[PDB]
């Protein structure tokens, strides 16, 4: 029994509410973060390590938690990953500014101090930003392959990650039109070694009963394209059989007349009737995913149909080649060879099943890292080195400024320091030694000494090619400061119910 | 009220169950909270003595174990465990609606067969046949079970084998004698001829005396009759100079004016020893006990020949040698704790009591529980013969005889459900010489390994356990 | 059976882990307000265990372990509790796995003798001719105190007290028994001296002579009694006049007036020593010193009760301390002399206490004439070697000896915990450094770091560790075998 | 109020999950105590295979739901010994909790278990004393199928049953691709019969009715239909004109086409079939749906239910000429065995017990994995816990020359593998500690790695003479898919349960 709706209880309730929603995403920071399991309630088990994938599927009841989770929603729309860092940083801002509020300091003062400290930090990040573009990254691209190597370095996967690094730089370079996660999929293939993987120039889909009809299709074809149909194909009591027989006749004749090589649909085709819909005289497909729907229309270009003898201009129009091959033994769909090719799909040929999780954790950011190292060149180091340099700068800026903001900017300083402290705690090392030995040579030797994720000792992430984008960090700590001062500026929450 | 009698007796038998056999685990005799501090003990005999027993039916089992206690020494735990196991067997037969008197009669005629089947395997040892040594050293060692004194165990068997030439009249247990001090170990005991009290006149009292005729003293206008009583006790010290004695037992307290006047007359007055040693002083040296000593004037004293008092190695190490009946072979160890005081005395009493039973009758049966299995199989074969409900009452009498080598295997840490059953099956054809070895935990030839036990304790266990069973089974109320 | 054995396990583990944080010199002090007004500010766990309100018997056995370790070696008093508690804690997995406690007991005995023989040959032997290693053990023991300035004042004195009488006790080792100790208020600390014979600190003032070469000793304990007993006082002092004694001690055992002026004037007419209320535990060793017989009986006085002496004076030693020094007895001087003189009270208690610690460490260095590198190193060594031994071992013992090994690792980890280091990681790197390097790798608590402690000079004599392991294993064995309690005698 | 989180979450799930393992650890081994299965509806059966136990049980905690989800993703991999994955799950989780007592982070425990598994599988390859020539191994395949049947009296008919198994893996032996597919389903279990009547028929005997209930069944000709043709007084006179029409157009279209034994799946009047019988050709009414592939493979054809596509090379097809009374007291069933070989092959079981039906389908599928693992990768390991003790010794040996805290995972790993010979010895009614450590001492004194736990209560602990044989794929998949899920459970900390209204 505790009632808290007066002003200092209002802000205390608000910051406890941000602390609990921060603890809801605390462990997921970093590449090897701890997984959180939630359900829908009916038995849809979702194990996640992402932040917004957790946060959207999470519940949120509190006012202040709802007015920070909107900033969290805003941060995933940029690149995705990083929503935990901004929320954890703003929560640590609030927890470090905590003892100053109930001791009797004004929220507008600490908001103004947060704003001035943010302007100082966004100044100081710009001077230490280093471009790395013309140091052989697109021509003699191997150093940009080197940061492609930063996903799975010095592991047993690293020998195959040489091929994966070459293919991820190819999966970026051959398609760079401000690439997305949509344009590059990964496809799991059971069986074989992990070195036998591939990156195909087109779509790739396993065929099931309701998926696609029959093999021996025109693979080596000059212009194989797609009918995208939304009507089924499958099969008074004397006046209802002849109409169905006639409909079978005209839907058979549609394949000859329209000239569609593979008809595509969201409707089941019978593989128990395999030769019976090879008696459609051509290939067909049904029950289609939306990535197949885009990447064979926005990239290949198969037209969409409506009626009984629906002919169009792009059911055998310009695509390069068809393929249907036993990739790992199982024959897959390939409407490869796209004339608008923002479509190159990764083919995870390998033995174990849970290595799909390994690749969708480790190469799903490697596409982001490589396409960002092409997209941004003014980059900085990672591993909490950048927050440590800004914390040193603002620790100096605090004590070199008279007035009450000196205690607050230092509160702005130490609140940065949970960014690597949560990292090593997600790694497993002691945070205290890995922070003190960091800060000593950080305040004596140089800047870009950072926290290594592998051996858990202080290394030089600038020389390990761990590049963090300067603009991404700028927007990250800007949003952290904004979500900080929004909750700090909030005192009253007027309810006014129904009844 | 017949069920709670079984419960009270079963609890008493359980409080010696985990101390059964020489792998027994010790219990705690914590007590009244004044100075109760601790007591660890492997001896289950002293466990029940320090039990404040509440149920009066369990008091009957306690005193039956007390009857077993002064008989041979060790054997209280086996009798109590066997009787409580018989009662746990009998209460299962009572719930099957059998009259207790039929169970009592079945106990009786089963115990007769179990008594004679011990006699069927009555093997006699060669110490009383061909004058061997080690065969009786085996029973002298296993009566020293759950103890420590194995170094001078050969000295214990020396006091055994010198008893059959020197300390038996009829297997005399009065010529034995044990004392000890502290500081040292198992390697301090040796042959002594009596108690440990010294010359007391001081630096002037010499060591060797001539002849110790020895008995008990008495003691040592109102003030003038007090001086007259002083004159009478001074008349006594004149009457003792004309004796010619050289030692005397001084059972009542005495200060220096009687004392120096005794010793100047040549009277060594030994101040109030424990009467058990004065028993050896009474005949084994030969000096009796009285209260007054007026009427012994030259003839009615004690009679001995030599008593000497030396001082060796931090003790009052007096070697009372040269007595007229030189049989009081005294053990003087210098043990470790206070526990060895009663332990060495009572364990030599327990050992040399059944060793006196062997110099009466040296038949023995193999220990380790195979004799229990033989009596079990013997009463099981008689159970398969007779009709009536009493054939059931024999079978449970078998079962307690299965539980006695079980518990010995149980407190050994080993499994006991298999090789006790394997021993029961193997005893039916692979005849009586097989048995359970507890030290190595297997089935072996007990006659080859020599783990035997005196017949005069096995018959006393197997008879008195059923005797305790038939008493408390026949009682139903209060 | 198991439900009470587990209770013994839990109670002994609770009484062991209550002092587990106090292990090592960085072990923090305690504060519990249990009892009727107890303030327990002390970093040493022996006096913590001596004030513990202990009700369980198995918990009381671990308190007995502390005094047993104090009597045997004096050092490792908390270690014999912490090792025992860890072994009784590790016995719970062996109990719940299915091993009967007798097998656990005998396997612990096998691991105990294996650990003893592994410890005793991985050491360095020190010799009685070596007096420099005695000063080395003194710098490990007598220093890091307030007698750090009195260490040069006190250590070679007791070293020379053993050099005088290298006494034949427990294989010519140091007993409590060199040449008699005293202690005296007032004066300064450097007024200690290595006496040769009996010294009395109690006050005698005789204007008459008490300074005789052939001085006699009468051990008359018989004080005066009131009435008749006046004539008895007269008769006693007639016997003392027939004696001729001048340095007789006199006790107040019978009554409280010991030499009143009827007896006192007749005993300053022959000028005797008058010292009353001789301290009762030192009385029997004064009897073992002189040779005069402990006889309060005034008529049992004889010519062989003439206690022998060579020089007896009520002499103002160190200027003003009128003490009674005696040499030339039959066996003059029993215990171990450090005359603790000093004006302050802390230099009276602490010099004597540190000399007792020096006594317990020099008797530890010659009962067993070896020495190991302390500070968690031999526990890690035993945990490695017994793990290899249990890997070679067969039967159900193969876990228990392994369970003997891991419970050995609580002494470094607590030493890692009390020193502020992360315990499990430092134990792991200590084990890995020891497995490919040396035995002497340990945790320097005096500087707070994992290093080679034989360079950093925190070593201990071997019999401390061997006695702690043996006593802890014996008590663990007995509490394992304890399986029943019964009240109401 | 209350909110369970943090490391206390990881404590609570493990004692949850190992409790499920504590249910299954008594089912390990062929001497394991096999176990009932009672539905919410009220049905009752007995099963020994742990995969059916975990699948048809309904759990409450989400960690156990994860466990049965992942172990059903192991049934396609092995299907045999999926109990041991759950047992090792509980074992590694208990040892991980023991490491969590000393303060090690569970991520370090997880990848330390991973490094210990990388010791484990490779040492399993080191101790792999397999016989790789097991292709024409018809004589040791008796011993291969012997231990699968060892819990019952099926060994007394293993001269029939194991030889059925070796002929089954002979007939499915695609010598290059080495797989049972969805068509090669090897079961026809006649509920009712005896031990030997489970025997050798590579054909189709389904419970469908006759053409005519007193028809001469001798249809030797492969000219056999299967129809997609349903039934779809001037009403009945027009329908009877459609009926004699359906005769003289469907059957005459058949006379143009060749679809003769017209096994219709739907309504029909048998007097047209009786007039076919006077013309001496059969036609069955109201037959079952999805058996067209099983019938049609009996010379080599495939599914042909069509009017017109069933031609003379894709007929309804028939296996081997034999005429036994299928229904003795039942209706005598279809003789679809006359002509040639069945690749999608299916065997005659007449097991009267649901236990012997359940084992002769799924242990035959487990043969179809491990005798697939006599062709796909012919690598066998001598089981019975010997693989686990040999592996655990080298895991403890590799836990010596490594300098990290991760070492304490590997020593926690190897002892966890010791639960496998313990539960073998516990379910066989012996001392679980002493037997396993005596076998471990016998292995550290004698370097044979085929010394295991005597589960069969035969002569010695040597698994050579008793041939307790698993495959190396079945061992490696087991250990790897126990480690890949112990890491999964250890990586999951906060189950914020939806709809469980967190106040």
Swiss-Prot record, chain A:
Belongs to the TCP-1 chaperonin family. InterPro entries: Chap_CCT_eta (IPR012720), Chaperone_TCP-1 (IPR017998), Chaperonin_TCP-1_CS (IPR002194), Cpn60/GroEL/TCP-1 (IPR002423), GroEL-like_apical_dom_sf (IPR027409), GROEL-like_equatorial_sf (IPR027413), TCP-1-like_intermed_sf (IPR027410), TCP-1_chaperonin (IPR053374). Gene3D superfamilies: GroEL (3.50.7.10), GroEL-like equatorial domain (1.10.560.10), TCP-1-like chaperonin intermediate domain (3.30.260.10). It is found in: Cytoplasm. Its EC number is 3.6.1.-. Mg(2+) binds at residue 81. This is T-complex protein 1 subunit eta. GO terms for biological process: binding of sperm to zona pellucida; chaperone mediated protein folding independent of cofactor; chaperone-mediated protein folding; positive regulation of protein localization to Cajal body; positive regulation of telomerase RNA localization to Cajal body; positive regulation of telomere maintenance via telomerase; protein folding; protein stabilization. It is linked to De novo genetic variants in nearly every subunit of the TRiC complex, including CCT7, have been found in individuals with a broad spectrum of brain malformations, and clinical phenotypes ranging from mild to severe epilepsy, developmental delay, intellectual disability, ataxia, and other features of cerebral malfunction. There is a cross-link at residue 404 (Glycyl lysine isopeptide (Lys-Gly) (interchain with G-Cter in SUMO2)). The modification N6-acetyllysine is found at residues 56, 294. ADP binds at residues 30, 82-85, 153-154, 383, 468, 473. It catalyses: ATP + H2O = ADP + phosphate + H(+). One of its GO terms (cellular component) is cytoplasm. It comes from the Eukaryota. The keyword Nucleotide-binding applies. The gene is CCT7.
Curated annotation (Swiss-Prot), chain B:
One of its GO terms (molecular function) is ATP binding. GO terms for cellular component: azurophil granule lumen; cell body; chaperonin-containing T-complex; cytosol; extracellular exosome; extracellular region; microtubule; zona pellucida receptor complex. ADP binds at residues 21, 75-78, 145-146, 368, 453, 458. The modification Phosphoserine is found at residue 37. Mg(2+) binds at residue 74. Its EC number is 3.6.1.-. The modification N6-acetyllysine is found at residues 131, 158. It holds the Pfam family Cpn60_TCP1. Transmembrane segments: none annotated. GO terms for biological process: binding of sperm to zona pellucida; chaperone mediated protein folding independent of cofactor; chaperone-mediated protein complex assembly; chaperone-mediated protein folding; positive regulation of protein localization to Cajal body; positive regulation of telomerase RNA localization to Cajal body; positive regulation of telomere maintenance via telomerase; protein folding. Keywords: Acetylation, ATP-binding, Chaperone, Cytoplasm, Hydrolase, Isopeptide bond, Nucleotide-binding, Phosphoprotein, Ubl conjugation. The keyword Cytoplasm applies. It is an enzyme of class 3 (hydrolase). ATP binds at residues 21, 75-77, 453, 458. Gene3D superfamilies: GroEL, GroEL-like equatorial domain, TCP-1-like chaperonin intermediate domain. It is found in: Cytoplasm. It catalyses: ATP + H2O = ADP + phosphate + H(+). Belongs to the TCP-1 chaperonin family. PANTHER family: CHAPERONIN (PTHR11353). This is T-complex protein 1 subunit beta.
Curated annotation (Swiss-Prot), chain C:
It is an enzyme of class 3 (hydrolase). It comes from Homo sapiens. The gene is CCT4. ADP binds at residues 24, 76-79, 143-145, 375, 460. Its EC number is 3.6.1.-. This is T-complex protein 1 subunit delta. It comes from the Eukaryota. Its main location: cytoplasm. Component of the chaperonin-containing T-complex (TRiC), a hexadecamer composed of two identical back-to-back stacked rings enclosing a protein folding chamber. Each ring is made up of eight different subunits: TCP1/CCT1, CCT2, CCT3, CCT4, CCT5, CCT6A/CCT6, CCT7, CCT8. Interacts with PACRG. Interacts with DNAAF4. Interacts with DLEC1. It catalyses: ATP + H2O = ADP + phosphate + H(+). It is found in: Cytoplasm; Melanosome; Cytoplasm, Cytoskeleton, Microtubule organizing center, Centrosome; Cytoplasm, Cytoskeleton, Cilium basal body.
From Swiss-Prot, chain D:
Component of the chaperonin-containing T-complex (TRiC), a hexadecamer composed of two identical back-to-back stacked rings enclosing a protein folding chamber. Each ring is made up of eight different subunits: TCP1/CCT1, CCT2, CCT3, CCT4, CCT5, CCT6A/CCT6, CCT7, CCT8. Interacts with PACRG. Interacts with DNAAF4. Interacts with DLEC1. Interacts with SPMAP2. It is linked to Neuropathy, hereditary sensory, with spastic paraplegia, autosomal recessive: A disease characterized by spastic paraplegia and progressive distal sensory neuropathy leading to mutilating ulcerations of the upper and lower limbs. De novo genetic variants in nearly every subunit of the TRiC complex, including CCT5, have been found in individuals with a broad spectrum of brain malformations, and clinical phenotypes ranging from mild to severe epilepsy, developmental delay, intellectual disability, ataxia, and other features of cerebral malfunction. It catalyses: ATP + H2O = ADP + phosphate + H(+). ADP binds at residues 29, 81-83, 151, 384, 454, 470, 475. This is T-complex protein 1 subunit epsilon. Gene3D superfamilies: GroEL, GroEL-like equatorial domain, TCP-1-like chaperonin intermediate domain. The keyword Cell inner membrane does not apply. CDD domains: TCP1_epsilon (cd03339). The modification Phosphoserine is found at residues 2, 308, 501. The keyword Transmembrane helix does not apply. It is an enzyme of class 3 (hydrolase).
């Amino acid at each position: 029994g505790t009632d808290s709706s007066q002003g200092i209880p209002q802000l205390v309730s608000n910051i406890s509410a941000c602390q609990v929603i921060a603890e809801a995403v605390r462990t997921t920071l970093g590449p090897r973060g701890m997984d959180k399991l939630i359900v829908d309630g009916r038995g849809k088990a979702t194990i996640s390590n992402d932040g917004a994938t957790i946060l959207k599927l999470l519940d949120v009841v509190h006012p202040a938690a709802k007015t920070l989770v909107d900033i969290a929603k805003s941060q995933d729309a940029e690149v995705g990953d990083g929503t935990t860092s901004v929320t954890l940083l703003a929560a640590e801002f609030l927890k470090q500014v905590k003892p100053y509020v109930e001791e009797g300091l004004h929220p507008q003062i600490i908001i103004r101090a947060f704003r001035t400290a943010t302007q100082l930090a966004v100044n100081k990040i710009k001077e230490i930003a280093v471009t790395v573009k013309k140091a052989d990254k697109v021509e003699q691209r191997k150093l940009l392959e080197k940061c492609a190597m930063t996903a799975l370095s010095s592991k047993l996967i690293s020998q195959q990650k040489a091929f994966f690094a070459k293919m991820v730089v190819d999966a970026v370079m051959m398609l760079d039109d401000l690439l997305q996660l949509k344009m590059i999929g990964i496809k799991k293939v059971q069986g074989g070694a992990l070195e036998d993987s591939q990156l195909v120039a087109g779509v790739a889909f396993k065929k099931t009963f309701s998926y696609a009809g029959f093999e021996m299709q025109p693979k080596k074809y000059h212009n194989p394209k797609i009918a995208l149909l939304n009507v089924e194909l499958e099969l008074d009591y004397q006046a209802i059989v002849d109409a169905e027989w006639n409909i079978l006749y005209d839907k058979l004749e549609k394949i000859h007349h329209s000239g569609a090589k593979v008809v595509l649909s969201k409707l089941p085709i019978g593989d128990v009737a395999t030769q019976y819909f090879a008696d459609r005289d051509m290939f067909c497909a049904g029950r289609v995913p939306e990535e197949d729907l885009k990447r064979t229309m926005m990239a290949c270009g198969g037209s969409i149909q409506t009626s009984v003898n629906a002919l169009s201009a792009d059911v055998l129009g310009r695509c390069q080649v068809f393929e249907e091959t036993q990739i790992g033994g199982e024959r897959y769909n390939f409407f490869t060879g796209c004339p608008k090719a923002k479509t190159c799909t990764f083919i995870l040929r390998g033995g174990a099943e849970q290595f799909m999780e390994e690749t969708e954790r480790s190469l799903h950011d490697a596409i982001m890292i490589v396409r960002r190292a092409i997209k941004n060149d003014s980059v900085v180091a990672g591993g909490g080195a950048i927050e440590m340099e800004l914390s040193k700068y603002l620790r100096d800026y605090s004590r070199t400024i008279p007035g009450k903001q000196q205690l607050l900017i230092g509160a702005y300083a130490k609140a940065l320091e949970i960014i690597p402290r949560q990292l090593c705690d997600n790694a497993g090392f002691d945070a205290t030694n890995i922070l003190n030995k960091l800060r000593a040579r950080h305040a004596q030797g140089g800047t870009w000494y950072g926290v290594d994720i592998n051996n858990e000792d202080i290394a030089d992430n600038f020389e390990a090619f761990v590049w963090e984008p300067a603009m991404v960090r700028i927007n990250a700590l800007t949003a952290a400061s904004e979500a900080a001062c929004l909750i700090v500026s909030v005192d009253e929450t007027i309810k006014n119910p129904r009844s | 009220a017949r069920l709670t009698s079984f419960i009270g007796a079963i609890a008493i038998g359980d409080l010696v169950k985990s101390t059964l056999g020489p792998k027994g685990m010790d219990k705690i005799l914590l007590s009244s909270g004044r100075d109760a501090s601790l007591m660890v003990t492997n001896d289950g005999a002293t466990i029940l003595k320090n039990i404040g027993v509440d149920n009066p039916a369990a008091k009957v089992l306690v005193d039956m174990s007390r009857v077993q206690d002064d008989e041979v020494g060790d054997g209280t735990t086996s009798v109590t465990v066997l009787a409580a196991e018989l009662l746990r067997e009998a209460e299962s037969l009572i719930a099957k609606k059998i009259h207790p008197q039929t169970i009592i009669a079945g106990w009786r005629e089963a115990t007769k067969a179990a008594r004679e089947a011990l006699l069927s395997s009555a093997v006699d040892h060669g110490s009383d046949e061909v004058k061997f040594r080690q065969d009786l050293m085996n029973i002298a060692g296993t009566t020293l079970s759950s103890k420590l004194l194995t170094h001078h165990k050969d000295h214990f068997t020396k006091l055994a084998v010198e008893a059959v030439l020197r300390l038996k009249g009829s297997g005399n247990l009065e010529a034995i004698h044990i004392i000890k001090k502290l500081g040292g170990s198992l390697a301090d005991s040796y042959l002594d001829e009596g108690f440990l009290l010294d010359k007391k006149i001081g630096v002037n009292q010499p060591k060797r005396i001539e002849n110790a005729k020895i008995l008990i003293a008495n003691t040592g206008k109102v003030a003038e009759i007090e001086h007259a009583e002083k004159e009478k006790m001074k008349e006594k010290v004149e009457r003792i100079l004309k004796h010619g004695i050289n030692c005397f037992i001084n059972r009542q307290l005495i200060y220096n004016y009687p004392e120096q006047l005794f010793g100047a007359a040549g009277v060594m007055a030994i101040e109030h020893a424990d009467f058990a040693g004065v028993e050896r002083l009474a005949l084994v040296t030969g000096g009796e006990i009285a209260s007054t000593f007026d009427h012994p004037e030259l003839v009615k004293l004690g009679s001995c020949k030599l008593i000497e008092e030396v001082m060796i190695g931090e003790d009052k190490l007096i070697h009372f040698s040269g007595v007229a009946l030189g049989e009081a072979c005294t053990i003087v160890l210098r043990g470790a704790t206070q526990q060895i005081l009663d332990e060495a005395e009572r364990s030599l009493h327990d050992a040399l009591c059944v060793l006196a039973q062997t110099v009466k009758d040296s038949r023995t049966v193999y220990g380790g529980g195979c004799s229990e299995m033989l009596m079990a199989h013997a009463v099981t074969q008689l159970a398969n013969r007779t009709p009536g409900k009493e054939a059931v009452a024999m079978e449970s009498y078998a079962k307690a005889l299965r539980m006695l080598p079980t518990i010995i295997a149980d407190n050994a840490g080993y499994d006991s459900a298999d090789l006790v059953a394997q021993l029961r099956a193997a005893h039916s054809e692979g005849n009586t010489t097989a048995g359970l070895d507890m030290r190595e935990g297997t089935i072996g030839d007990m006659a080859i390994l020599g783990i035997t036990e005196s017949f005069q304790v096995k018959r006393q266990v197997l008879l008195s356990a059923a005797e305790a069973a038939e008493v408390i089974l026949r009682v139903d109320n209060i | 059976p198991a439900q009470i054995r587990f209770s013994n396990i839990s109670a002994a583990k609770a009484v062991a882990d209550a002092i587990r944080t106090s292990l090592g010199p960085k072990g923090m002090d305690k504060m519990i307000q249990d009892g009727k007004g107890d303030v327990t500010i002390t970093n040493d766990g022996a006096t913590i265990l001596k004030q513990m309100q202990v009700l369980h018997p198995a918990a009381r056995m671990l308190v007995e372990l502390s005094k047993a370790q104090d009597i045997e070696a004096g050092d490792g008093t908390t270690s014999v509790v912490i090792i025992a508690g860890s072994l009784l804690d590790s016995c719970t997995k062996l109990l719940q796995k299915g091993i009967h406690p007798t097998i656990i007991s005998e396997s612990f005995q096998k691991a105990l003798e294996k650990g003893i023989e592994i410890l005793t040959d991985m050491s360095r032997p020190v010799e009685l001719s070596d007096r420099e290693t005695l000063l080395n053990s003194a710098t490990t023991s007598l220093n890091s105190k307030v007698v750090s300035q009195y260490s040069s004042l006190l250590s070679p004195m007791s070293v020379n007290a053993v050099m005088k009488v290298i006494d034949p006790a427990t294989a010519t080792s140091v007993d409590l028994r060199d040449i008699k100790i005293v202690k005296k208020l007032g004066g300064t600390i450097d007024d200690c001296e290595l006496v040769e014979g009996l010294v009395l600190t109690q006050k005698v003032s005789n204007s008459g002579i008490t300074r005789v070469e052939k001085a006699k000793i009468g051990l008359i304990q018989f004080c005066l009694s009131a009435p008749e007993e006046r004539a008895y006082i007269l008769n006693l002092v007639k016997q003392i006049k027939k004696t001729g004694c001048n340095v007789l001690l006199i006790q107040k055992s019978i009554l409280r007036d010991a030499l009143s002026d009827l007896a006192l004037h007749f005993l300053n007419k022959m000028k005797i020593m008058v010292i009353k209320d001789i301290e009762r535990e030192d009385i029997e060793f004064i009897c073992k010193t002189i040779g005069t017989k402990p006889v309060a009986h005034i008529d049992q006085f004889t010519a062989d009760m003439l206690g022998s002496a060579e020089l007896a004076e009520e002499v103002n030693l160190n200027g003003s301390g009128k003490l009674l020094k005696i040499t030339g007895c039959a066996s003059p001087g029993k215990t171990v002399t450090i005359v603790v003189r000093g004006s302050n009270k802390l230099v009276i208690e602490e010099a004597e206490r540190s000399i007792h610690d020096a006594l317990c460490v020099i008797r530890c260095l010659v009962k067993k004439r070896a020495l190991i590198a302390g500070g968690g190193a031999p526990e890690i060594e035993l945990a490695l070697r017994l793990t290899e031994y249990s890997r070679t071992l067969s039967g159900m013992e193969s876990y228990c000896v392994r369970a003997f090994a891991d419970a050995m690792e609580v002494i470094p980890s607590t030493l890692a915990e009390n020193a502020g280091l992360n315990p499990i990681s430092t134990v792991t790197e200590l084990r890995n450094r020891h497995a490919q390097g040396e035995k002497t790798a340990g945790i320097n608590v005096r500087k707070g770091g994992i290093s080679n402690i034989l360079e950093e000079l925190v070593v201990q004599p071997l019999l401390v560790s061997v006695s702690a392991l043996t006593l802890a294993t014996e008590t663990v064995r007995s509490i394992l075998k304890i399986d029943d309690v019964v009240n109401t005698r | 109020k209350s909110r369970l989180m943090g490391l206390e979450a990881l404590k609570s799930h493990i004692m949850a999950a190992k409790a499920v393992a504590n249910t299954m650890r008594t089912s390990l081994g062929p001497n394991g105590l096999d176990k009932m299965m009672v539905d919410k509806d009220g049905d009752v059966t007995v099963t020994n295979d742990g995969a059916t136990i975990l699948s048809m049980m309904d759990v409450d905690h989400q960690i156990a739901k994860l466990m049965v989800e992942l172990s059903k993703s192991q049934d396609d991999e092995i299907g045999d010994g999926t109990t041991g994955v759950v047992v090792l799950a509980g074992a590694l989780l208990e040892e991980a909790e023991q490491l969590l007592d000393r303060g090690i982070h569970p991520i370090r425990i997880a990848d330390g278990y991973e490094q210990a598994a990388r010791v484990a599988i490779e040492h399993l390859d080191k101790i792999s004393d397999s016989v790789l020539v097991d292709i024409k191994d018809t004589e040791p395949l008796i011993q291969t199928a012997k231990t699968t049947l060892g819990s019952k009296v099926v060994n007394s008919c293993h001269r029939q049953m194991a030889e059925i198994a070796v002929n089954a893996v002979l007939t499915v032996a695609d010598m290059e691709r080495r797989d049972v597919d969805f068509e090669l389903i090897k079961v026809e279990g006649k509920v009712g019969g005896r031990l030997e009547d489970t025997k050798l028929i590579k054909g189709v005997i389904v419970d469908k009715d006759f053409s005519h209930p007193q028809m001469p069944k001798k249809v030797e000709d492969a000219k056999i239909a299967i129809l997609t043709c349903p039934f779809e007084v001037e009403d009945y006179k027009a329908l009877q004109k459609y009926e004699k029409e359906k005769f003289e157009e469907m059957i005459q279209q058949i006379k143009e086409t060749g679809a003769n034994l017209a096994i219709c799946q739907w309504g029909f009047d048998d007097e047209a079939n009786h007039l076919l019988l006077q013309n001496n050709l059969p036609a069955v009414r109201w037959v079952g749906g999805p058996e067209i592939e099983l019938i049609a493979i009996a010379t080599g054809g495939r599914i042909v239910p069509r009017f017109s596509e069933l031609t003379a090379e894709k007929l309804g097809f028939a296996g081997l000429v034999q005429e036994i009374s299928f229904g003795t007291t039942k209706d005598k069933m279809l003789v679809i065995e006359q002509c040639k070989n069945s690749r999608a092959v299916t065997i005659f079981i007449r097991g009267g017990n649901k236990m012997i039906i359940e084992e002769a389908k799924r242990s035959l599928h487990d043969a179809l994995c491990v005798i697939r693992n006599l062709i796909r990768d012919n690598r066998v390991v001598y089981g019975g816990g010997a693989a686990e003790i040999s592996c655990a010794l080298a895991v403890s040996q590799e836990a010596d020359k490594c300098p990290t805290l991760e070492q304490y995972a590997m020593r926690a790993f190897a002892d966890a593998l010791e639960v496998i010979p313990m539960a073998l010895s516990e379910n066989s009614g012996m001392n679980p500690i002493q037997t396993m450590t005596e076998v471990r001492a016998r292995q550290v004194k004698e370097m044979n790695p085929a010394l295991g736990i005597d589960c069969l209560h035969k002569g010695t602990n040597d698994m050579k003479q008793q041939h307790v044989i698993e495959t190396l794929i079945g061992k490696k998949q087991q250990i790897s898919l126990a480690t890949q899920m112990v890491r999964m459970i250890l990586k999951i900390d906060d189950i914020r349960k939806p709809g469980e209204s967190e106040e």
